[PDB]
């Protein structure tokens, strides 16, 4: 990719935490809803990290009001300035596409 690798090399993001699926994280995103700026702290669990470099995206799954939301952010995306990780976790899968309980009992991935 060396020269396409260079096409994206000055287009990276830095110091962002290490996080794999399972980690509950807390994405402070830039959204301009109403005023001249706003930050929405989308908290949830990373149920996916489809990688690639800059092309790498995670999918934070929140459970909002008896209804979930699967919000697929790109890493390195400039509408993100704080991917706070709340809680880590070493889970079995790499894509956590089973999170369809919403009864909560098994909606929580056990700690690590």
């Amino acid at each position: 990719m060396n020269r396409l690798d260079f096409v994206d090399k000055p287009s990276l993001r830095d110091d962002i935490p290490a996080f794999n699926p399972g980690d509950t994280i807390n994405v402070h995103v830039k959204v301009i809803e109403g005023a001249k700026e706003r930050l929405q702290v989308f908290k949830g669990v990373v149920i996916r990290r489809q990688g690639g470099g800059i092309r790498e995206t995670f999918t934070v799954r929140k459970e909002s009001y008896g209804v979930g939301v699967e919000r697929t952010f790109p890493v390195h995306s400039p509408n993100i300035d704080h991917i706070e990780v709340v809680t880590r976790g070493d889970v079995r899968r790499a894509k956590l596409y089973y999170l369809r309980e919403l009864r909560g009992k098994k909606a929580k991935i056990k700690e690590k």
Binding site: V31, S64, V69, E70, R71, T72, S77
Partner: protein
């Protein structure tokens, strides 16, 4: 999300089901997004309340399971489809709505649902 698609009415008017009769907005348009008026019959409401069954009434979609791309580069996938009935004036027929709403509604501008949503986006 098209004609013959039951999607749960999330507002305080009793309806839990609407089969989209039409997708209002274009000739031979098919798929209604997060925030585009659909027609909808009423498959299932409370008997006696605000609305009955079988009513050809508009509605606005606030939840589609299919990911909507925002022109930033991120997506918004929801768990279950949802449409708040509306009036022809920039007002929802209902007064509150249950659950988040796709922010893709500040643009189509019924900015009274984005007002009365429990959480926008």
């Amino acid at each position: 999300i098209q004609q013959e698609s039951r999607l749960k009415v999330a507002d305080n008017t009793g309806a839990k089901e609407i089969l989209c009769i039409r997708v209002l907005g274009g000739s031979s348009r098919r798929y209604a997004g997060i925030g585009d008026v659909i027609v909808a019959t009423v498959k299932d409401a409370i008997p006696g309340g605000n609305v009955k069954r079988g009513d050809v009434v508009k509605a606005v979609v606030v939840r589609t399971v299919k990911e909507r791309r925002r022109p930033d580069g991120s997506y918004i996938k929801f768990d279950e489809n949802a449409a708040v009935i509306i009036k022809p004036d920039n007002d929802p027929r209902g007064t509150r709505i249950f659950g988040p709403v796709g922010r893709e509604l500040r643009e189509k501008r019924f900015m009274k649902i984005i007002s009365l949503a429990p959480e926008v986006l």
